[PDB]
């Protein structure tokens, strides 16, 4: 019997890379998920080779970044690739999310998969914030201050927990030390969670783009879809090169390159582009505890999507109104991010409040009523009496 399917260390890899009957009608989004995996692995590798030459003290953290910038042979490539690959990783993860939401992969037979995934999502957001603190530029210090102080909204005892997590009464050596150590720790936990993600995926294959049974025919994994991954990963490499060489400082914001100074802050302090959507809803509602709870409530209202989509027909490939509403929702999401980026003045508070309302409304009530209307229309159209 073939040695590929006999040895255990290889019988494992056979069932996941060499023989896994993916569905016939795959498009480029699952290849995009493979792209995301490779982005994660290159991020890990370049992170190791980064921390190989990175200090940790607060007084010698910025100097360490300039040192990795220039005084190491072929090192600026490492730093820019780390940062821009992180940003591209977040964008591709957002697009992975939006794909999953559109095609109805969140239908019941994969709820464990979807929950595990959103756990990777929240973990990855935490990792990004942790590393951005690890830089300790100028506005990263204020971002760390605010996000640590976020937990002070907890009722009764709130000061003790924040002072514990914040290493004292000031941002000092233990603060950045612990932040960097945890940042260097967490992605391996992400790796564990994503091997669980793969485990949970393998139980029931991957969904068709048509939202219909794929058990009829399937084509082998290797020699067919490995190249569908290769083409897209080459596209990723070239676009990342374009952003890392010719146009380095676009995706990020040109403020990190300042020594930390807890005395003066600029009037324009914003998160990096992939945290604007939640920052908008945080600054939208006029309360502290309400905003703190409503961020994690945005994550939870993401969670609640299954057993709410009550369309008997899976996916949004054959529902004009549902797909139109999904597009209004994604444009809602980008509008939310951009308004968060812009300053808050008279014509913006109302804008943001309405934006959050339509956002959460789409999660809660738009999907069920629209879905029911689609289902009843589908029944009534093709019935005589």
């Amino acid at each position: 019997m073939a040695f590929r399917k006999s040895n255990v260390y290889l019988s494992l890899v056979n069932s996941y890379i060499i023989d896994s009957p993916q569905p016939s009608s795959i498009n480029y989004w699952w290849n995009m998920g493979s792209l995301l995996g490779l982005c994660l692995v290159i991020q890990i590798v370049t992170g190791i080779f980064m921390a190989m030459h990175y200090s940790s003290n607060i007084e010698l953290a910025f100097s360490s970044v300039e040192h990795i910038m220039r005084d190491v042979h072929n090192g600026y490539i490492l730093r820019y690739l780390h940062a821009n690959g992180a940003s591209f990783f977040f964008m591709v993860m957002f697009m992975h999310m939006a794909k999953g939401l559109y095609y109805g992969s969140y239908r019941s037979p994969r709820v464990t998969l979807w929950n595990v995934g959103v756990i990777i999502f929240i973990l990855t957001i935490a990792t990004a914030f942790l590393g951005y603190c690890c830089v300790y530029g100028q506005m990263s210090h204020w971002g760390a201050t605010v996000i640590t102080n976020l937990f002070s909204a907890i009722p009764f005892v709130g000061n003790d927990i924040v002072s514990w997590l914040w290493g004292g009464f000031s941002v000092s050596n233990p603060t950045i030390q612990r932040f960097f150590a945890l940042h260097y720790l967490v992605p391996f936990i992400i790796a564990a969670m994503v091997i669980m993600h793969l485990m949970a995926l393998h139980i029931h294959g991957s969904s068709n783009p048509l939202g219909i049974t794929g058990n009829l025919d399937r084509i082998p994994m290797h020699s067919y879809f490995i190249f569908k991954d290769l083409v897209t990963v080459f596209l990723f490499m070239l676009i990342l090169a374009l952003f890392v060489f010719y146009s380095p400082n676009t995706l990020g914001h040109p403020d990190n390159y300042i020594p930390g100074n807890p005395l003066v802050t600029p009037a324009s302090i914003v998160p990096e582009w992939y945290l604007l959507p939640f920052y908008a809803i945080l600054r939208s509602i006029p309360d502290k505890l309400l905003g703190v709870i409503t961020m994690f409530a945005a994550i939870l209202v993401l969670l609640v999507l299954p057993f709410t989509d009550r369309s008997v027909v899976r996916g949004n490939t054959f529902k004009v109104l549902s797909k139109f509403f999904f597009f209004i929702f994604v444009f809602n999401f980008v509008l939310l991010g951009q308004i968060g980026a812009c300053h808050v003045e008279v014509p913006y508070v109302l804008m943001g409040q309405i934006a959050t309302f339509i956002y959460f409304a789409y999660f809660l009530i738009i999907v069920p009523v629209i879905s029911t209307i689609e289902n009843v229309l589908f029944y009534i159209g093709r019935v005589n009496k």
């Binding site: 514990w164 004292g168 009464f169 000092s172 233990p174 005395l263």
Partner: protein, 54 residues
């Protein structure tokens, strides 16, 4: 008698787990020298009228 023995083990184990977790968690708390409650003085003779001193 058997359940009493098992419960005694559980009680000791719970006390020990509490102690170990408390040790590990209090490892991350504020250290001693960080608790240096600094005190500063400010000269008010030369401060400008319409200016903010930090």
């Amino acid at each position: 008698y058997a359940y009493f023995m098992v419960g005694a083990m559980g009680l000791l184990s719970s006390a020990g787990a509490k102690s170990t977790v408390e040790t590990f968690i209090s490892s991350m708390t504020a250290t001693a020298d960080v608790l240096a409650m600094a005190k500063v003085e400010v000269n008010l003779a030369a401060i400008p009228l319409g200016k903010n001193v930090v």
